[PDB]
Design a protein around this ligand. Structure first.
Ligand SMILES: OC[C@H]1O[C@@H](O)[C@@H](O)[C@@H](O)[C@@H]1O
Ligand SMILES: OC[C@H]1O[C@@H](O)[C@@H](O)[C@@H](O)[C@@H]1O
Ligand SMILES: *[C@H]1O[C@H](CO)[C@@H](O)[C@H](O)[C@@H]1O
Ligand SMILES: *[C@H]1O[C@H](CO)[C@@H](O)[C@H](O)[C@@H]1O
Lengths: 225, 236
């Protein structure tokens, strides 16, 4: 995350860190709790490392230093990458992770509501990725305005969402992929976007791109059975 | 394709024809669309004409005759031949083409999925080669795209079959013991694909041999899954 302030604990209980830890761990990507045994994240996070048993998932934390031997992790029972996703492009950048053991929610770990079709205000982003360019131990926060896609074009499908100041200076960078773009409306927080890609980490006029969760609901419901 | 049959329109929408204008414009290789601006092919296709500006790339067609000099072709912005490939030699025989201009996906022009490193134990039972190559050992390029189905022949038995050359892990062998069904001259760089699940996957790229359907001498194919890191690296 870049352009943004440090994270209160409990403020974003749905945020998880996906880590691989082959022999030792490493935070590679973010994700969102959406169900007791379900995390939503970006397909491209698993390009280099599609091996599910190697991944480890941590929620309800703020400082990655808190993770230790006696820190319960979640495991991937099943990794469901969209079938149209292809490594060479940013289309269909979405993935469901079915957890091995269903979580028991707390003050610090709870799900996000999926979007059920409007004009969002108060949209936010989070993550453990650097500002500018290394990895931060403490989760981060920045507020951002949606950019209409048709303007976003400066190929961007109906399945994408864009956000960013075109003055620039706040966006997400590596390690923030698969993390959530959320919005606060009808009094309720919703998960509107999944961070996917943008050229650079936004500088000046480069809005970031996000998978648009609402247009993948059929998919998500289909795959959760 | 020796021992094949006509493809239908839209059947193999990732298949492209790689041509060059020497005399009349001429088909020299095949290739596979793997993204809007990415085409995967064989590196030995450029052995004699390693000048990118010269090549025209055509997709979404069944008959090469459909191609008039008024049909729009894609051009090569960037030719990425694998770092370790050497010209006469048969290893690392793979190349990425970055197109000058994004393609438009249609019914007849689609990309094909690549295999995942987590697919590498998969046993594929339903495999196909397609191309405009010769249909007999000494023959002519074919107007209508050919298809042929052909079984994978495991590494060790394929090595047995080729005493003089070395068949490494980066390759993959397909053919019948009797022979008679194979890729021929003009099919190089084209796709070997396999249906697994409900999904087509690019499993190989036609490479060497071009014995063109000799007895017990399976066509040899570049094993795509072996190059995922390379591809991921080059396509960013
Ligand atoms: O009829 C199907 C078509 O298939 C191809 C060739 O066999 C043509 O002669 C034929 O018209
Ligand atoms: O005919 C060329 C066409 O190619 C495809 C799309 O990019 C269209 O916008 C364009 O008109
Ligand atoms: C969050 O808090 C850390 C403490 O490590 C500071 O580096 C900085 O104030 C950031 O906003
Ligand atoms: C509730 O679920 C938690 C998930 O971690 C387990 O520790 C346990 O099975 C309990 O029933």
């Amino acid at each position: 995350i870049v352009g943004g302030t440090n994270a209160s604990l409990g403020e974003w209980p749905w945020q998880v860190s996906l880590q691989v830890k082959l022999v030792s761990q490493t935070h590679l990507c973010g994700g969102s709790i959406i169900g007791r045994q379900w995390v939503l994240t970006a397909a491209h996070c698993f390009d280099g490392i599609p091996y599910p048993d190697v991944w480890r998932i941590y929620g309800g934390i703020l400082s990655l230093s808190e993770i230790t031997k006696e820190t319960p992790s979640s495991r991937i029972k099943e990794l469901i990458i969209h079938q149209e996703y292809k490594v060479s492009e940013g289309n269909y950048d979405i993935a469901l992770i079915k957890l091995q053991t269903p979580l028991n929610y707390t003050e610090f770990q709870k799900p996000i509501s999926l979007p059920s079709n409007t004009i969002y205000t108060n949209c936010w982003v989070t993550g453990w990725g650097y500002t500018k360019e290394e990895t931060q131990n403490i989760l981060q926060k920045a507020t951002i305005p949606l950019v209409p896609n048709e303007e976003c074009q400066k190929v961007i499908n109906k399945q994408m969402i864009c956000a960013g100041y075109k003055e620039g200076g706040t966006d997400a960078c590596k390690g923030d992929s698969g993390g959530p773009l959320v919005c606060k409306h009808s009094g309720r927080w919703q998960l509107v976007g999944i961070t996917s890609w943008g050229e650079g980490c936004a500088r000046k006029d480069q809005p970031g791109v996000y998978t648009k969760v609402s247009e993948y609901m059929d998919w998500i419901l289909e795959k959760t059975q």
